[PDB]
């Protein structure tokens, strides 16, 4: 049965003596061996989000749990350093405190957190070989890849990082510099300020250290996370050599749940509990035999794979054909397989309906993104290339990351491209499955460049009556793109390197 637990608030010194506000949660046995230890850095102070409650529910499975506010948070001393070396070292300091002051088992230590605490936890697992298991929710592996994907600043990601920070605590120098840049609309400057110190804040840069330490790593993110897109997390997951599981879902806001305002359903920490129970309490619950990749579609049904490479088995290659039409020039997506030698010119810097997200209000703390639909017949063909596949007469499932190869010729040295994959119904209404930005800065005008874009991973049930539609344009409401009205982009498909969309259908 579940442990009765006692919760005590106290202040625990960090590595340098900085006082951290902590809830120490301890089973009451009593007679009465040691319990596995979980150290759990809380995340952003979003209203209604119950971090300590989540920690208590884990402790009730039979764990000592330390739920705490990182340096700089309201309840702690210090400054927020964006999961910098001090914040990460503090996890080790709290492990040491727990081993000396609670009935914690030094041989059975795990760490778990969400978002700020997820990145912190993974970094701690790289730096502290005592950690045997990690569960990181809605986190990152590569901070640069997350906020500056293909050299395109994620304006709404960066803005959200600032907004979340301002409700959570007192910024250190790095975050205050970001805040100052964002206030001016200077997203590129925000990025430039962070890049030199981003690698030490990125689990991906510590992949060898985590693999050496071989903790059991559980990752669970939303495909539509507003801060940290899935590709960078998948790439990290794929490189882990030890026990591991990746679960990806579509997020939505649940009401009256501990984590519903973060877009995380209660089922995630249910699975985390099972993960730790196996790896830290040797419970024979079969989690060791479960597939390493588990994906939940937008309709809420699960699929699974033994590894990420399996998602791409038998991917369909659609060749892009030359856009044609009297009124609405549109190309095809042609399975075996397309045209070469064509050219299609659009103007850069023009607005279209195809966007990754809506214009969003100053200070909003929405942690998942709900892309607007786009009516494909109103996507301006002088502003975008549009390629449509055939209407399906049977349901299909897309699981994985689509890839696009496209050759582009800019007339300006600076252009940003955006590729979007839509499920388009028979009437023309598109729901966005995936997208990716790509900035060409300092390109040679008039020189064709072949680009390989990997769109963000997704899991999507495509119903009978729908088709896949690719849109490529040059502006997006969520990114600080550098395209200029008056410039041009010409799409081509050279015989040597045809323009192709690869889609992982199942």
The number of distinct structural domains comes to 2
Q: What's the main sheet like?
A: 12 strands, mixed
The CATH topology of the largest domain is what?
Rossmann fold
Annotated CATH homologous superfamily of the largest domain: Alpha/Beta hydrolase fold, catalytic domain
CATH architect. name of the largest domain: 3-Layer(aba) Sandwich
CATH level 1 class label of the largest domain: Alpha Beta
Number of distinct beta strands: 26
Q: Please give the share of residues in helix.
A: 10-25%
* Rg from alpha-carbon coordinates: 24 Å
Protein model, in words:
The chain has 506 residues and is of the alpha+beta class. It has 2 domains: 4-290, Rossmann fold (3-Layer(aba) Sandwich); 312-503, Galactose-binding domain-like (Jelly Rolls, Sandwich). The chain has 10 helices and 26 strands. The chain has helices at residues 51-59, 85-101, 116-127, 143-147, 155-168, 173-183, 187-194, 207-213, 230-239, 267-281, and strands at 4-13, 19-28, 35-41, 64-68, 104-114, 131-137, 148-149, 152-153, 216-222, 244-249, 293-296, 302-305, 316-320, 331-335, 343-347, 374-375, 385-388, 396-400, 403-410, 415-424, 429-440, 449-454, 458-462, 467-473, 488-492, 500-503. Strand 11 and strand 12 (302-305) form a beta hairpin. Its EC number is 3.1.1.3. It holds the Pfam family PepX_C. It comes from Aquipseudomonas alcaligenes (Pseudomonas alcaligenes).
